[model samples]
Structures are given as C-alpha cells and as structure tokens.
Target: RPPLRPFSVVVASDEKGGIGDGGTIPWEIPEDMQYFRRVTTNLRGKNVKPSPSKRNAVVMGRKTWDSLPPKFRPLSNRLNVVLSRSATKEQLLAGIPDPIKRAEAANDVVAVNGGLEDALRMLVSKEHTSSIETVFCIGGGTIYKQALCAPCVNVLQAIHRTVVRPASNSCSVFFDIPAAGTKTPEGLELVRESITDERVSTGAGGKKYQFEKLVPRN
Candidate 1:
C-alpha cells in the first residue's frame, strides 16, 4: 500500500543531465531557487492538504544539508531530515547549538543511518503521518538517483535548464533523465510542461527552460 502522503522528487538538471559542478550547482538562477522554495513549502495549495498549521517535509543527503548556508541550515518552515551513515541524532543536533534552534532541530530534524528508501518509508509510516504532509526528496546526486529509482516516488518536479557544456566542463554528478523531448524512465510520463523566461538567465544569453511534472503511468 502507498503511504498516506505522496513521495516526490525535486531537481534541476542541465541539458546533459548535469546537476552539479564541483560541490555546487553549475548555474546561479535565483528564480530556480525561488521555484524550489515555493514548491517545497506550498503543501496546502495543491497536492496534499495537511492540517491548517502543518508544513511539508524535505529529505536530503548529509552533503546537501552541509551545502546550505548557515542562516538557512534548518531551512525554516519545514521538517528537515538528513541521511547520514556516520552521524548520530545527538551529534547532528549538537552541530547546531542555540537553545531554540537546537530544540527546533531536535524536534523537526531526523538523522537516518540508512539508505534513502528506508528513511522515507519510516517517515511516511503511521509514526509520522500527522506531522508530515508530503515528502520532497531534495538531493545532492546520489539521493536524487536513489529516489528516482524507488517505487515509492509518484511524482518528479524537474527544472530543465537550457544550458550545455563540453565534457571537460561538465559536472561529475548527474541525474538519470534522458534528453529533453525523449521518453522518461519506464514507469513515468510527462504530464505537464511550463516554460518561463522570468529570472533564469545565466548572463551568457537569454535562457528559456521548462518546468516539467512527471507522474507515474497508469
């Protein structure tokens, strides 16, 4: 049976499936960041409707959590679950040590010492049904691939950027989606596409990209 809440993936990848360069995103599109924020936080608008006061949950790898800026470490207004094989829950909480922040992190953060699938299964179980509305698999690279391959993932929200680079300049980390306009993996279908030119240019030239929503095929 499916969990009470839907499991989804949110990612941004270049034309060749490149999602990261070195340790950061290759492009600096503020609009993409804004879009991520809006999608991950808007649980009440569509998708799943939680209680009036509940917020959505975001699951990410430890590196992704470390990549976040200090001020936004806990990523305000959402439940933050970090997957790490080496960190304990107490150690994870100790890293951020303001009484209020610690309490918030303790209450809202969960440190998992296992794979992404197991952690997600636990989150969507009866134990967390009320506190978590939806599960957003925010990624580094490994987490994205794992989530994409997981059967529990019902939807994929991908920002398809119109940027390309040579092999030497390409990123080591990548998503597994095929080139734009081609078919997605076996079970997924492209259900919606929205093109926007709003603040996404990388300063090399004007950029027009599509925000695609892929759902499982019936």
Candidate 2:
C-alpha cells in the first residue's frame, strides 16, 4: 500500500487575523510570497525534487483559484486542486465566470466537488499515478477553516503579521487564529517560531512578524 501523505495548511494573516480584502489578499509582501513558494514547493525543507512522476500538491478554494493571475494559474510544477461545489473539470479548465479571460495556462487543474476529506483521500489513493509527497492547503477563508479543523491536517505554517490593518467593510475575508497565549484544538502545539528583523521588515514596514510551525503533540 502507498504510504498516506501528510497534509498541512499555510496562511499569512494580519494583526486582526485578516487575510483578504474583497476577494484578494490585503497586502503583497514579496518576502512572504517567496517564503510561501519555498515552503509549498520544497515541502518546508523536506527538499523533495519534482521528478517526472512525483510532485507536491496545493489545494485551494475556487475563489482563491479565480483570484490568481492567469499567468500563475495552476502554479507551475505542482498539481493544483481547487475546492468547489459548482465547478467542473471543463469549467475549471476554461476558467470560471469569464472563461476566455482567465483560461488556465497550466497543464492541469483538478476540480474537487464532494468535500475536503474526500478530495484528499482521492489524491492519496492508488488511483492517482502521480506520486504526491506533500499536500498543502493554501486558501481562501472557508477552505482555511475546513482544512485547519480537519483531522488529517497534521501541521500548520502560519505567517503572523504584527501590524493591524484598520477596520473596514471592505475587509471581508479573514483567517481564524487562536487567541494570544491560547492553545489550538486537537493537540496542535507550536513547534517552532522564527523571527528576524529582515522577515519583519519584509512583511510590512517596521511591522514585526514571525513564521510559526504547528504540529500535533505527542
């Protein structure tokens, strides 16, 4: 039997736990983007190579997929799976809402309909010939909530922003974080935290931030 793959979540949130304004991320931190690419692509230092047959997988909500620039769709060199109840493989391939405007440029897109758990099971099953070494739940708000609460999610890599964005009706999407000094449910514990002047500055001007890795407690 193929070994079951471990799944994780990656997210960056501001001081109010806000992740997006409208349908897009509130801020563009180049360093954070680099870190995201590195972590998701390299499996956070697991250093797995993308052989002809194996690669990492990134799962995100339909809105997240739509929000990605057409050029970046399918996020090259990895399997891209989108969570959606209404989207089909054809629609996904052609792009949603505006088909021609956002047609996918990447090789493939897997549209998962049932649920997050079902989608995950399908990915790890023998049916998929492509060997998936790690699964990262990259997100929009709803998917983040579901992935974080799911039992199969073994880890969470969160970028915490120290700068608080002012309240606004435009800020609609948010990530739920455990309150300061509180523990996460399901035995999750913080395993590591890296804070540096560069990382903080890269995230936002003079704003402190840190990367946190959480795993299940023994």
Candidate 3:
C-alpha cells in the first residue's frame, strides 16, 4: 500500500474535552456545525474547484455516519469513507436506493474494513488513486481516539477544535488532547493558540466557546 498521507482531525468538544453524551453531541452549536461543513469541504491550493476526478475526503466511523442527519447522507461534493468492522462494503454501497444517488455514491461514498489506516490505504489504492485531495478525520469518540493516537497522529497536519465552555460534566466520553508545548509519554504536543487571542464564539443555551487550532509538535 502507498504510505498514508497527511490529514486533519476536526471536532468540537467541551471544556473537559468531552465530545459526547451517549450518542449525541451535548450542545447545539449551529455555528460550529456550519464551520465543520465549511472546513471539511473548503479546498485550497490545487483542489480549490470541484471536479469529477478530484475532491476532499472525510474518514468517519459507522457511529458517526449513522448519527449524521439523513439529509446529509453520502455528504455531497466529497468522498465519504465510512470505516466499519463488519466487512460489508459491497452491501452498503449496493443498498443505495436512488439511481441518481447510487450513481453519485458509486463515486462519492465508500466503506472500508478496519480502522483509519485501512481507509487511508484504500484511498491511495488502485480504486481511488489520485481521486482525493485533502483528507479529514470527522468523528465519533472511537475514531477520534484512534485518529488522535500514535502512528496516525504523528502525520496529522492540523487539529481544528471548537471547545465549549461552562462544562457539561455529564458527558460520557472525552478526547485526551495533548497539552500545548508539552510532550506526553507518547511524545505528543500540539501548538494551541495564544490564550489572550483565542477567538471566542457563542452558541445556543448560553454556551461559550473558543476555536483552537493544534498542529503536530514535531
């Protein structure tokens, strides 16, 4: 397999690094949702325009895919690679009911076995070589943890975190972020934004948040 390429992880979490409670995001931040859509779809440098042969890609787990609203299924304009352990790629792709949707999905949507590495390998495999430009790890807690680990995390290009404040202590899962400027036991450190200039944003239910960018420490 060709070597894995650089990709970014994009997510929103609470002050305690809490990402979800049960299966749902604990907060309603339409702005962050919009920001996610734009960041995942927005292309720069050579991939700035749409094309039949080129587009950005998102790597997500089955849970994340299932949690995505129906209207956004097969997320338009990009390759949606859902990673699952069921080994049901053919069935999933074949199950698309609409001829038009199926046709578009035949080219746009895919499911792969195993984890992020598998999906990354499949991207550069014979079936999709030169087909994708930018790559992103859009998440559920499981994939976020894997994507944030060694091997994969070392090659990560950037991390876009929208952190909510007024801690929702009720959340059941968390993303253990690497402390800025300090490497952990796993040799991880991210470049977080300045405390003074950290851009703050507001969302529903009187929630406050800041958009932080973390880059690979090496």
Give the top-scoring candidate (lDDT): 3
Error of 3 at 30 (Å): 0.9
Segments of candidate 1 deviating more than 4 angstroms: 1-5, 45-53, 97-100, 153-170, 179-189, 197-199, 202-209
Tell me the tens digit of each residue's lDDT in model 1 across 1-218.
Answer: 55424577778776667777747765556556777887877766556544324777888888888777656677777888889999877777776747677776676678888767767668767657777777788887888777656454454444333333332255788877544455555554444455443333553433344465654434
TM-score per prediction, in order, is: 0.76, 0.76, 0.85
Kindly list the per-residue Cα lDDT of model 2 for residues 1-218, writing each as its tens digit. Answer: 33334577778776667778748876656666776777777733455576436777888998898888766776776788888899887777775344553454334568889656766767867645357767778888887776656454443444333333343335678877565455676544444354444344444443345565654434
Sort by TM-score, top down from the best: 3, 1, 2
| Prediction 2 TM-score vs. true | 0.76
Reference-based lDDT, residue 111, model 1: 85
**Which pairs of residues collide in candidate 2?**
none
Clashing pairs for predicted structure model 3, backbone only: none
Which 10-residue span in candidate 3 carries the lowest summed lDDT?
193-202
- 135, model 2: CA deviation in Å? 0.3
Model 2 residue 182 distance off true place after TM-score fit, in angstroms:
2.5
Deviation (Å) of 11 in candidate 3: 0.7
lDDT accuracy of residue 195 in candidate 3: 29
The positional error of residue 215 in candidate 3, measured at the CA in angstroms, is: 0.4
Which has the greatest TM-score? 3
Shift of residue 209 alpha carbon in model 3, Å: 1.7
